[PDB]
Design a binder for these strands. Structure first.
Ligand SMILES: [Mg+2]
Ligand SMILES: [Mg+2]
Lengths: 175, 151, 191, 50, 202
RNA sequence: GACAGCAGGACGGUGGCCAUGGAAGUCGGAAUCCGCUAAGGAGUGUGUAACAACUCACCUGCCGAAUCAACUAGCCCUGA
């Protein structure tokens, strides 16, 4: 993958070819996060080839559709499961992200695994994405954003890098 | 009053206890000789001797200790002349002599009246601990006697 | 993990007054006054209470070392309150070997002059801090009392004394000699 | 010989933990060498008594 | 462990509350293992002493069962090393005033209160040399016939004075009786009664 | 009602058993239980050559709600 920009959620169903020895393939289904549908189909073939006896030649993809957000105007909590491959050995991982949409939360997951653990898009295999509610979040960051009547100001906010003239008589303050 | 927890032979090879004794200076040989006379035939094994001194002599009392009479219920004599076969033979029954023993035990155990002293003196041994036909884990649990007849 | 606000709570008694012009804290009390600057930390210092004097030391997002730093302000404000109400008294008994240590004061107790100094002939002089007064104790052998207001100045002067009295080029397991800080406390007792 | 003053001098000179790697007098309740010449190692040992 | 043991301790305390409806509140702030052995083996034939942590605050739950009279009065009284003494026999106001037994009084560093140590001119009666402790503190002594006597009459430990290690060793060797302190009775509880023992009982 | 912190207790059998210059929890070999218990491990260390004193496991007094341990990999440091 690349994870170029924000990600997109795709529902992809796929089956084997109808053979005379075995008709009616089971027509499996997954949930692929990808920048576009071509990467969704290729990563679908990757996961289904690693799970069951399937390959791209002897199989087909029936439907590959965009999955829109069930509630885009709601600030939600997402638990992500990870199968990332580190330098020594691969590890499982549970992470939490407070974000609006599922594709945005998985985007933050890819960016955060790139930032902290230096993991590329090759090693990350998203195991499961689940919306969890309040009072079940393990993480202290999302647990401390769980505050009604929350207060914080914005101290030392500097901005406008040369939007002002480069040569002014000012000396700009913050807040 | 002097207390001592030793015993082999008498010894007296220019080595003795005296320290409290030479305040009155009476034991230098006579106290050791009377200790020999009280230790005739009792015994060839470690005991506890206390001598009461009132200005003229020594009264020798043997307060019997628990592990020391556990060792005294072995088979004497073993002092020299082909020792070490090996250390821990110990084939005795001790079915009632230990009962009479903790009947003698008084004001030093912080005890129940023969309640768990069966467990105490059954597991405080190291050479015997049972007649050779059973296992002492049954001695620890399955004794239901003594606690009525002994008090 | 960018923790939202950590605040420390300080109660200030009615015997003293506090005044802040920013991150500079000026505490006035019975035993003089004391002012310090917290310019290099950037933590909000607010006060509240009409003649109740409840100080709050509040820091927003920050990092873990800065959340460690926000308690240091509360602790030094507590130390300034204790120094302006009671003062600091450090008692130093002269643990001396075969050679004694003769300690005199020269300039108003601000110049401690040490002689006989482990048998060395070199008479040593130690100039103390501006704001600390020293004295030789009575009814006790070779005790040296350092009294002052600022705990940093008093304890740095005592550190200069206990490092001026130092066994050099020998074993210091044997020759346990020098003027060590024996007791730390306040001037006015029973408080 | 003032055994209380000897205990005080041993408190300020003797009861320390010496590190086996950085050779630093640290603290009796220390865990790591505070100096950055060894890498804050936990290979400590008590200061030697007679 | 420490779950079946705590359930067994709750069984022991419900057995004592269902068997003995009369109790004494005591405190053991100056305690010893040999002291508790002596107290227990002197009081085997009568009332039984029990101690513990916040599990002793179980009368609240026993009242939340609602099978009791007003037993909840002693709930603000278990503060500062409070233990129970369960009794059945008394009905008798001479207990523990004739049984407040004297205990050693073995010298140990730390205590300050309440008494003094006055050592008159009296020989030691100990072995040689037994002058190292006297030279460590500083006591004018004179050697008679071999037991060594003390010339002056000085006080070692005053009121509110810290007991030291060398002072403790010399008092343990000379066997001059140091600070001793037994248990403290604080509140009597006899069948839902609120006693004020300052001074009503005994 | 935990982790910390401060304070108190840390026994009886028993100076246990093989040893001998001593082992009386502390060089060693084996073992390893019971009573009082609130709690004591035939004992985690320090010490005197031993006997002794100190501390810890364990329990309790005050405080008061979150805490501890072992691994793992990203940056940086020591290794250099
Ligand atoms: Mg040299
Ligand atoms: Mg490098």
């Amino acid at each position: 993958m690349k994870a170029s920009g924000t990600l997109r959620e795709y529902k992809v169903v796929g089956r084997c070819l109808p053979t005379p020895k075995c008709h009616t393939p089971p027509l499996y289904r997954m949930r692929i996060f990808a920048p576009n549908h071509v990467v969704a189909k290729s990563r679908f073939w990757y996961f289904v080839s690693q799970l069951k006896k399937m390959k791209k030649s002897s199989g087909e993809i029936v439907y590959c559709g965009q999955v829109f957000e069930k509630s885009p105007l709601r600030v939600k909590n997402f638990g992500i499961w990870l199968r990332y491959d580190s330098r020594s050995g691969t590890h499982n991982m549970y992470r939490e992200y407070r974000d609006l949409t599922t594709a945005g939360a998985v985007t933050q997951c890819y960016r955060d695994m790139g930032a902290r653990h230096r993991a590329r898009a090759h090693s990350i295999q998203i195991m499961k994405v689940e919306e969890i509610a309040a009072s079940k979040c393990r993480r202290p960051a999302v647990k401390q954003f769980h505050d009604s009547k929350i207060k914080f100001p914005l101290p030392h906010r500097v901005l406008r890098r040369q939007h002002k003239p480069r040569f002014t008589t000012k000396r700009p303050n913050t807040f | 009053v002097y207390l001592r927890c030793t015993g082999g032979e008498v010894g007296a090879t220019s080595a003795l206890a005296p320290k409290i004794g030479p305040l009155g200076l009476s034991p230098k040989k006579v106290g050791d000789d009377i200790a020999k006379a009280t230790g005739d035939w009792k015994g060839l094994r470690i005991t506890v001797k206390l001598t009461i001194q009132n200005r003229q002599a020594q009264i020798e009392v043997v307060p019997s200790a628990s592990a020391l009479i556990i060792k005294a219920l072995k088979e004497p004599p073993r002092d020299r002349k082909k020792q070490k076969n090996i250390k821990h033979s110990g084939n005795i029954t001790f079915d009632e002599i230990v009962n009479i023993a903790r009947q003698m035990r008084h004001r030093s155990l912080a005890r129940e009246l023969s309640g768990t002293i069966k467990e105490i003196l059954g597991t405080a041994q190291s050479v015997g601990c049972n007649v050779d036909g059973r296992h002492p884990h049954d001695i620890i649990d399955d004794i239901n006697s003594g606690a009525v007849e002994c008090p | 993990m960018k923790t939202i606000l950590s605040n420390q709570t300080v109660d200030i008694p009615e015997n003293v007054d506090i005044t802040l012009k920013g991150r500079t804290v000026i505490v006035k009390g019975p035993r003089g006054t004391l002012r310090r600057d917290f310019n290099h930390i950037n933590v909000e210092l607010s006060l509240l209470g009409k003649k109740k004097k409840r100080l709050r030391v509040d820091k927003w997002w920050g990092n873990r070392k800065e959340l460690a730093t926000v308690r240091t302000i509360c602790s030094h404000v507590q130390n300034m309150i204790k120094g302006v109400t009671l003062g600091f008294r450090y008692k130093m008994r002269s643990v001396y070997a075969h050679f004694p240590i003769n300690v005199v004061i020269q300039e108003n107790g601000s110049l401690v002059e040490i002689r006989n100094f482990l048998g060395e002939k070199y008479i040593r002089r130690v100039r103390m801090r501006p704001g600390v007064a020293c004295s030789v104790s009575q009814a006790q052998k070779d005790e040296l009392i350092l009294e002052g207001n600022d705990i940093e100045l008093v304890s740095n002067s005592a550190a200069l004394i206990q490092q001026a009295t130092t066994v050099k080029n020998k074993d210091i397991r044997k020759f346990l000699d020098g003027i060590y800080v024996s007791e730390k406390g306040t001037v006015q007792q029973a408080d | 010989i003032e055994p209380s003053l000897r205990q005080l001098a041993q408190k300020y000179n003797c009861d320390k933990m010496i590190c086996r790697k950085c050779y630093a007098r640290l603290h009796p309740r220390a865990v790591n060498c505070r100096k950055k010449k060894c890498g804050h190692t936990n290979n400590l040992r008590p200061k030697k008594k007679v | 462990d420490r779950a079946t043991w705590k359930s067994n301790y709750f069984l022991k305390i419900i057995q004592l509350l269902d068997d003995y409806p009369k109790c004494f509140i005591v405190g053991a702030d100056n305690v010893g293992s040999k002291q508790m052995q002596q107290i227990r083996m002197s009081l085997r034939g009568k009332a039984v002493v029990l101690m513990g942590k916040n599990t002793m605050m179980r009368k609240a739950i026993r009242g939340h069962l609602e099978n009791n009279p007003a037993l909840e009065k002693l709930l603000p009284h278990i503060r500062g090393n409070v233990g129970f003494v369960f009794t059945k026999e008394d009905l008798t106001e001479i207990r523990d005033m004739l049984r407040a037994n004297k205990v050693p009084a073995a010298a140990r560093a730390g205590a300050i209160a309440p008494c003094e140590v006055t050592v008159p001119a009296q020989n030691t009666g100990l072995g040689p040399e037994k002058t190292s402790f006297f030279q460590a503190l500083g006591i004018t002594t004179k050697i008679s016939r071999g037991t060594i006597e003390i010339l002056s009459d000085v006080q070692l430990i005053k009121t509110g004075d810290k007991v030291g290690a060398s002072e403790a060793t010399l008092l343990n060797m000379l066997n001059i009786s140091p600070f001793s302190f037994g248990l403290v009775i604080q509140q009597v509880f006899d069948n839902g009664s609120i006693y004020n023992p300052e001074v009503l009982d005994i």
